[PDB]
Enzyme design. Structure first.
Site, PDB file in Angstrom:
ATOM      1  CB  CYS A  20      -0.875  -0.018   1.238  1.00  0.00           C
ATOM      2  SG  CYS A  20       0.043   0.257   2.759  1.00  0.00           S
ATOM      3  CB  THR A  73       7.193 -11.885  15.531  1.00  0.00           C
ATOM      4  OG1 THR A  73       6.905 -13.089  16.255  1.00  0.00           O
ATOM      5  CG2 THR A  73       7.226 -12.185  14.043  1.00  0.00           C
ATOM      6  CE1 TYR A  92      16.543 -20.316  11.460  1.00  0.00           C
ATOM      7  CE2 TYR A  92      18.033 -22.212  11.798  1.00  0.00           C
ATOM      8  CZ  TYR A  92      17.161 -21.482  10.986  1.00  0.00           C
ATOM      9  OH  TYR A  92      16.881 -21.930   9.713  1.00  0.00           O
ATOM     10  CG  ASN A 115      10.482 -12.559   6.262  1.00  0.00           C
ATOM     11  OD1 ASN A 115       9.961 -11.448   6.158  1.00  0.00           O
ATOM     12  ND2 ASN A 115      11.650 -12.857   5.674  1.00  0.00           N
ATOM     13  CB  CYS A 123      14.061 -15.861   6.764  1.00  0.00           C
ATOM     14  SG  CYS A 123      13.168 -15.946   5.239  1.00  0.00           S
ATOM     15  CG  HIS A 124      18.440 -15.967   2.070  1.00  0.00           C
ATOM     16  ND1 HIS A 124      17.774 -14.760   1.978  1.00  0.00           N
ATOM     17  CD2 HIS A 124      19.705 -15.735   1.650  1.00  0.00           C
ATOM     18  CE1 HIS A 124      18.605 -13.839   1.518  1.00  0.00           C
ATOM     19  NE2 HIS A 124      19.786 -14.404   1.318  1.00  0.00           N
ATOM     20  CD  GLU A 150      22.951 -13.272   0.059  1.00  0.00           C
ATOM     21  OE1 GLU A 150      23.560 -13.252   1.166  1.00  0.00           O
ATOM     22  OE2 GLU A 150      21.720 -13.081  -0.069  1.00  0.00           O
TER      23      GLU A 150
HETATM   24 ZN   LIG Z   1      -0.589  -1.280   4.321  1.00  0.00          ZN
END
Ligand SMILES: [Zn+2]
Length: 157
Positions: A20, A73, A92, A115, A123-124, A150
């Site tokens: 948005c 989170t 982790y 995620n 997250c990888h 990478e």
């Molecule tokens: Zn939004």
């Protein structure tokens, strides 16, 4: 939110981006100016096609509901985004500590599974340990491919 969508071709297949005016919401694996969605597209395109310049590209504002309220989170995802750079990994357990709860490896794994914007929030790059790449919500091969892209030791093409 009033949502807008765009798609991007990538070495990993088509990516659907949604957002948005207040920020990017999701990057989904289906198998360019100031708005967050255009910044996200430019960022992901650079990630794949101009990775040497990736730090030059603005990170889009994020507006998925997980980013709208304080939580552990949100801390996991924000700290991961802030700290763990292209070509690095973190365990982790150490990410748990970074996010303010050193004991909480299982909770970090669950947070990462939620995620909404993979790759951008990497997250990888979160692994089990030095010699154990760990699992991946998007499939082990994809995680290993991204790490290879990478240049990381734990990557496999
Ligand atoms: Zn939004």
């Amino acid at each position: 939110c009033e949502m807008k969508r765009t798609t991007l071709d990538s070495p990993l297949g088509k990516l659907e981006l949604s957002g948005c005016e207040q920020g990017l919401h999701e990057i989904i694996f289906l198998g360019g100016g100031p708005e967050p969605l255009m910044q996200a597209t430019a960022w992901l395109n650079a990630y794949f096609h101009q990775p040497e310049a990736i730090e030059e590209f603005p990170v889009p504002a994020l507006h998925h509901p997980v980013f709208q309220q304080e939580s552990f989170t949100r801390q996991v995802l924000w700290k991961l985004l802030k700290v763990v750079k292209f070509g690095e990994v973190i365990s982790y357990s150490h990410l748990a500590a970074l996010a303010g709860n050193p004991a909480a490896t299982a909770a970090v794994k669950t947070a990462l599974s939620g995620n909404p914007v993979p790759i951008l929030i990497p997250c990888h790059r979160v692994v089990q340990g030095d010699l154990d790449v760990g699992g991946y919500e998007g499939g082990l091969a994809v995680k290993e491919w991204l790490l290879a892209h990478e240049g990381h030791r734990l990557g496999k093409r």
